[PDB]
């Protein structure tokens, strides 16, 4: 037998013997004896309860297969302990285990040359999924994992663009063209990299909430009013509810984030205090026709200083699926085409 089974977590993770000593993070970490490193291992059980579920399995598995940049996580190998397609049940999706997720980075105090770093990392990945048009919608921190040494990768894709703007858990990194059904463009992400940025700033979420009125609510609390240039791109309906809120001037970057949460004391603390503030003001602007491009904040001098062209400047991922995003199958034909590629 090429498998064995263990309980993980309150989880039966049935793994290929090279994995050793799995360990909790449906994730654990392992020690992979014929590479002689630390992975991550992965679970995808119910991939076939649903299309949803089957779609997103299928789409997950060939993107992290073609896709190869080092701020996106990539695939180590992909196995089934199933013999047959009859069989088949569970997929187990191995990769490069790294040390924290950035859930936990976010509650470290501020630092400028990590937080200017792993920003740019971010914006590096997204540049490079921007490129092979996948934009992601609903990036947050869980989802991005760091090493010791803050190098950083994006954990996942984000729904089919035939998806749009809905999602049928965490709502707070979403941007308002999302929350409000406006339809969405590549900067669309950049809302959510500013949201994860105020939180390193603040360590509180910007925006909470029990759902998307409590989170409307929030950002108008704290920007301020949207402009009829925004007003009039929502369609009639929501914007009734939008006009009837009670009217905010909003506060300023500075009153948002007052210098207090930044380090002291020194002119280059002074400066970097100034240009975090100013990446904040330009990637929180609630129409996405006047907020920042990801091409330009990485031009931001908060984040340039990083900036390497032989990083940022990768030729886009080329898509073999050219109707990954839209075709529509059976549970059945699902089924086999995830087979197939886990298989190959
Ligand atoms: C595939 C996947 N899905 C979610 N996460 C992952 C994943 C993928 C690769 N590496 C890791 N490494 C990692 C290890 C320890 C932690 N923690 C530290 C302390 O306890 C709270 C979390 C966090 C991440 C996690
Ligand atoms: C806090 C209030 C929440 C209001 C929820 C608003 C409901 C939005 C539904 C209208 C859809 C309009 N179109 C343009 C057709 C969607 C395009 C596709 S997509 O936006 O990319 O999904
Ligand atoms: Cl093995």
Redesign the pocket.
Known sequence: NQFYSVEVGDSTFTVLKRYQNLKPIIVCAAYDAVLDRNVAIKKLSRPFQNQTHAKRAYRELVLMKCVNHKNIISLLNVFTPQKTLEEFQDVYLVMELMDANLCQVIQMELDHERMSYLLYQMLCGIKHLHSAGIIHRDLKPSNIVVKSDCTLKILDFGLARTA???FMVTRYYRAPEV??????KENVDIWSVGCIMGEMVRHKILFPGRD??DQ?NKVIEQLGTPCPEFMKKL?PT?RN?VENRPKYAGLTFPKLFPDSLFPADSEHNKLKASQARDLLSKMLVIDPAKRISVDDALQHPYINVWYDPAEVEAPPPQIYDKQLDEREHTIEEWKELIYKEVMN
């Open positions: 749009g703007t809905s929350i409000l059904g406006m339809g969405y998307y009125i409307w369609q929501v509810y």
